[PDB]
Amino acid sequence: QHQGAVELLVFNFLLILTILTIWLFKNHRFRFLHETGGAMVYGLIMGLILRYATAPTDIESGTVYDCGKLAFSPSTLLINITDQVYEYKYKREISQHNINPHLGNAILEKMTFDPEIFFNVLCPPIIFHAGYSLKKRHFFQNLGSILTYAFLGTAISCIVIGLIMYGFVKAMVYAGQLKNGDFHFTDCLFFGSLMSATDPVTVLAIFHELHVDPDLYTLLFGESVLNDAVAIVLTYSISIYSPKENPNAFDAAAFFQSVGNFLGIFAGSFAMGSAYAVVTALLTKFTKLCEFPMLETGLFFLLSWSAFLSAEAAGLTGIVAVLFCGVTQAHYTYNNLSLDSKMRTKQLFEFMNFLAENVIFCYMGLALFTFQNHIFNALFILGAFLAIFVARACNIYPLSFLLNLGRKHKIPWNFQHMMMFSGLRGACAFALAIRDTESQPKQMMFSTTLLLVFFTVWVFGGGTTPMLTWLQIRVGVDLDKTESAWLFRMWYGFDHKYLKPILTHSGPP
Amino acid sequence: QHQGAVELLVFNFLLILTILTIWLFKNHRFRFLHETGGAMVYGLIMGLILRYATAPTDIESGTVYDCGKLAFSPSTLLINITDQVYEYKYKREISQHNINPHLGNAILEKMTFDPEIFFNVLCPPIIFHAGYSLKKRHFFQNLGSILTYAFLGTAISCIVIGLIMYGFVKAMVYAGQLKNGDFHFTDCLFFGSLMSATDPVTVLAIFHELHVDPDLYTLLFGESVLNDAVAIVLTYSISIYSPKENPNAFDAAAFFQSVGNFLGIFAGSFAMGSAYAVVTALLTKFTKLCEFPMLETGLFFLLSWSAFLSAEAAGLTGIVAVLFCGVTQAHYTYNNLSLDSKMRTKQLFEFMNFLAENVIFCYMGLALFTFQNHIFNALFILGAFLAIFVARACNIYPLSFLLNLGRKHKIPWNFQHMMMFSGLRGACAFALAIRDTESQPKQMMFSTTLLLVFFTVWVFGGGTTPMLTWLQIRVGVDLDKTESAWLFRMWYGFDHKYLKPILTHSGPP
Ligand SMILES: CCCCCCCC(=O)OC[C@H](COP(=O)(O)O[C@@H]1[C@H](O)[C@H](OP(=O)(O)O)[C@@H](O)[C@H](OP(=O)(O)O)[C@H]1O)OC(=O)CCCCCCC
Ligand SMILES: CCCCCCCC(=O)OC[C@H](COP(=O)(O)O[C@@H]1[C@H](O)[C@H](OP(=O)(O)O)[C@@H](O)[C@H](OP(=O)(O)O)[C@H]1O)OC(=O)CCCCCCC
């Protein structure tokens, strides 16, 4: 063996060093850096010292076999060698024979990760922890505004970024950096939808540490949680778009079917999550499992995982279903578990989320491991840099004014600048970029997104505190009907009238 | 996709049903069955209803390719298809072309697991939980007796089982069930070493529930923890045995080198575990990480995993190293962590152990998934049945009398019958049997071990309570120097003199 052990030990060493440096920084109260940034810089340093360590080496070239009567490449095959059947699995396709001698040199360790690892084992824990960790205080007086933000602003920013990137591509055509025709408006819309998920983890951590006003914290948290799933489903729907004839056409009667597919996927995921949540709530309520914390904790975890797996197997998106199942569980089941099971579940899920996010950011810090990188054409980077800023500018202020028109007697003025500053890009955009490879435009967007994350995360983590002090934002604040469109009051009355007495309020806690 | 999702959902459903039935049984206090037995019977039922559901189907035969100039089958290869390099990984070798049409029928879902999964991800959590969960009360007055038991009795039982199985094979040669010459004394010794690890999880659970005398509980726990690692290393050393000439020779000057390899492996694993434990203890003591439970918990978990990975990568055995690291950590570091981190680590590790053992037993309950089963030749099964009983008989009473000669003023008489009754076989024997396949003798021992586990676990789980009542064993007992060879007193004085003031006793807890 001794292949996975080395990389796992390297990851453990990097994580331990990151934790030690974070403790050292927090002991002196230097701040100006989060554990995510430390993991990123440690990954970058590790990659830099690994690439330029044993570069002079031998050149390894794979064997070439002329397999006649084979016009297709199946994933699975059975090869007859020495009259014996051997199961051969197609792993990946390599079309870089020209650069193969360069790939042989400085090979070291590939240390690559499967692109679905960020989807089936890494993201769902973080998403479920975010959904479960709901304050249940506030977040209802501003639920409507959060909804309009996370829904309309995502599409607005996607459209703006797509249009600006299409304009920059058209300008490049005049500049003639490369061939014209490869790029399309569909790719620009894909990039715009991808560059719309915001995960200001460092900003939220600073807000929690400094005890900022809970309204801004709740707004930012709700937006950052919802827009991730919104952008994921929107990106999937955009990738679904494929006209039968005249590729990259405009209004080919598939807009309606794409919208229908998006709505159906969202509704199905929400329904599955809610159904599983009420199923486990009823199971906990009817039974008397409060005397065995291990059994109920295992049932809770297994039911959550089964909800995720059933959402994935049905053809829908498991991330949004996990989010909705988690929020519904925290709403209903949390009032039925024993006093010990609540602590067990909360601590376990928060530890899993911490470990997953640290591993994600540490792997994201590795930028030298991708051999087919396309970090060039600085005009593209400048265009993306301007596009993200202008999209964030047009996202907040118009919608903020529209909400302030019919404001719920609580005008949120001077807080829009904080939302402007908080524009970090999390793991969702990186995973969506790494999902698709072996394509020059796709590699271009992946490299630009990596550079944008590398810049913006560090710069805003450094500048959060001075920006907070300059805006005179209140700090140190202790946490301890008709205005809400009259619909949320009716929903609350319906919840407290029928669902509460049956799903909870009875049974030994 | 939709391949792993189905099997994962099936596993989740089976586990949920097992937990529900366990709660139903415990509500009425019927007992007579543990969660492990429930998982086993549910797996057996699932396999039975899956095998005989859609048996009539089509016959699938793999393609045959005449790859000339290929006298070897590498694990990795690069195939040139359509002038493109495809990475093909050799997964498994199939030499069952004669039964291939039968394999095509009733294929359903393979649901198989990689044999190393029981080794690198499943066992280490259980082993670390067992090592960490040390009472620290008693277990020292009887440490010497536990050592002599787990060391001498394992080898004695292995030798007895090997000799008896060799005699039964020789009798079969006269009976002529199959060809003579395939079996060897090395295989008999391998089987004897494999059938020596005892994991009486149900007996220990019943003892904990009924509050039995702590002396017998501590003795059984220590024996069951130590003999597993002892048998693992002994089996590896036996598999190492390979004479240069005259295969299956007797006393080929390799006995000394095998003993040296065994001793070196044990010493290296113990040294690695202890070194990592003192490293993390010193790190916790010197720093002031008591104010951040998440950071210290992550450091603890990462250091334990790194200890396991470094033990595995060095060429030694990671299970015994994990065990020793866990016991040393529970001895030293547990007195330095904050009051919250202790609860976090304990609860997380016990939950991981519970989930891992439940999954292990549920997978063990699947006996119809292995197509190349050799459940026949009932004389072999009868021989193994007699051999395990006589080995357990000769394991306890002679060593018990020898210990009672120089007894530490505490004669353990009438408790030997309880140790005789507790003779369950856990996951270690099953994993060691499943490690090696594609061999008629190996399949024979695997099938016999599976049958032995299936019988003994259920029968002893059923009969534990009447056997306890018949022996008049005290129940309901509340837990709350020179005699110890004078060496353990010196060790305790040395620990309390030098190591304790430096490794602990200082720093904010
Ligand atoms: C919503 C609930 C909370 C979020 C989810 C929490 C669960 C969580 O994050 O960890 C999942 C892990 C591992 O489970 P997980 O890693 O997610 O399982 C992966 C899937 O089977 C995936 O298939 P698809 O997803 O269908 O494409 C496969 O390709 C991966 O193989 P690869 O890694 O070699 O690439 C598997 O690793 O499983 C446990 O830890 C408990 C069971 C361990 C013992 C049984 C093992 C079979
Ligand atoms: C002593 C300490 C306590 C006992 C050990 C506790 C740790 C524990 O049991 O789970 C281990 C899991 C998974 O880690 P784990 O499953 O053990 O990792 C396996 C090894 O890499 C194995 O290689 P070798 O062992 O060298 O042969 C490989 O073949 C398996 O691939 P396969 O599954 O497709 O067959 C991997 O799954 O990792 C975490 O849960 C935290 C990190 C997750 C995020 C990073 C993922 C890279």
The domain spans of chain B are: 117-503
Separation CA A240–CA A259 (nearest Å):
11
**What architecture (CATH level 2) is domain A117-503?**
Up-down Bundle (1.20)
The verdict on a CB contact (< 8 Å) between A12 and B309 is: yes
Cα angle A282-A132-B301, degrees, rounded to a multiple of 5: 115
Q: Are A457 and A258 in contact (CB under 8 A)?
A: no
**A to B CB pairs, distance under 8 Å:** 193
- B65: Cβ contacts below 8 Å, ≥ 6 apart: A67, A79, A80
Separation CA B480–CA B100 (nearest Å):
63
The verdict on a CB contact (< 8 Å) between A84 and B93 is: yes
Separation CA A95–CA A85 (nearest Å):
28
Q: Which ligand is nearest to the CA of B304?
A: 2
**Best CA proximity match to B95, nearest among A81, A77, A76:** A81
**Pick from B6, B8, B81: which is nearest to A70 by CB?**
B81
* Strand, coil or helix: A425: strand
- Identify the experimental approach: cryo-EM
The verdict on a CB contact (< 8 Å) between A306 and B16 is: yes
**Best CA proximity match to A407, nearest among A228, A212, A223, A144:** A144
Residue-wise over A329-340: b if at least 16 C-beta within 10 A, else e? bbbbbbbbbbee
A residues 145-184 near B, CB within 8 Å?
Answer: none
The verdict on a CB contact (< 8 Å) between A88 and B77 is: yes
Identify the sign of the CA torsion A192, A194, A195, A200: positive
**Best CA proximity match to A78, nearest among B65, B223, B156, B313:** B65
A residues 268-297 near B, CB within 8 Å?
Answer: 287-289, 292, 294-295, 297
A-chain residues within 8 Å CB-CB of B8?
Answer: 305, 309
Q: Which ligand is nearest to the CA of B280?
A: 2
Residue A304 Cα distances to A132, A325, A421, B13, B467, angstroms: 11, 7, 35, 12, 41
**Best CA proximity match to A150, nearest among A207, A208, A240, A233:** A233
Alpha-helical (H) ranges within B241-317 are 255-286, 293-313
Separation CA A248–CA A186 (nearest Å):
7
Alpha-helical (H) ranges within B287-405 are 293-313, 318-332, 339-364, 378-405
A-chain residues within 8 Å CB-CB of B307?
Answer: none
**Best CA proximity match to A258, nearest among A165, A186, A181:** A186
Centre a 10 Å sphere on the Cβ of residue B498 and count the other Cβ atoms it contains: 10
Q: Are B427 and B40 in contact (CB under 8 A)?
A: no
Model resolution, angstroms:
3.1
E runs forming strands in A286-388: none
A198 pairs with which residues across the strands? Answer: A425
**Best CA proximity match to B415, nearest among B225, B157, B213, B222:** B213
Cα angle B407-B409-B414, degrees, rounded to a multiple of 5: 75
**Pick from A23, A289, A301: which is nearest to B295 by CB?**
A23
Separation CA A335–CA B129 (nearest Å):
30
* Strand, coil or helix: A133: coil
Give B470 Cα–ligand 1 centroid separation in angstroms: 47
The Cα of A366 is separated from the nearest Cα of chain B by a number of Å equal to: 20
Interface test with B, best of A42, A79, A342 (most B CBs within 10 A): A79
Separation CA A509–CA A340 (nearest Å):
10
Q: Are A153 and A399 in contact (CB under 8 A)?
A: yes
Give A126 Cα–ligand 1 centroid separation in angstroms: 14
The verdict on a CB contact (< 8 Å) between A63 and B78 is: yes
**Pick from A8, A23, A81: which is nearest to B70 by CB?**
A81
Specify the pairing of strand A76-81 against strand A84-94.
Answer: antiparallel
Provide the residue type at A194 as one letter: L
The verdict on a CB contact (< 8 Å) between A298 and B348 is: no
Q: Is A338 on the interface with B (CB under 8 A)?
A: no
B-chain residues within 8 Å CB-CB of A129?
Answer: none
Q: Is B339 on the interface with A (CB under 8 A)?
A: no
A84 pairs with which residues across the strands? Answer: A81
Residue A3: closest C-alpha in chain B:
B313
**Pick from B2, B27, B289: which is nearest to A313 by CB?**
B2
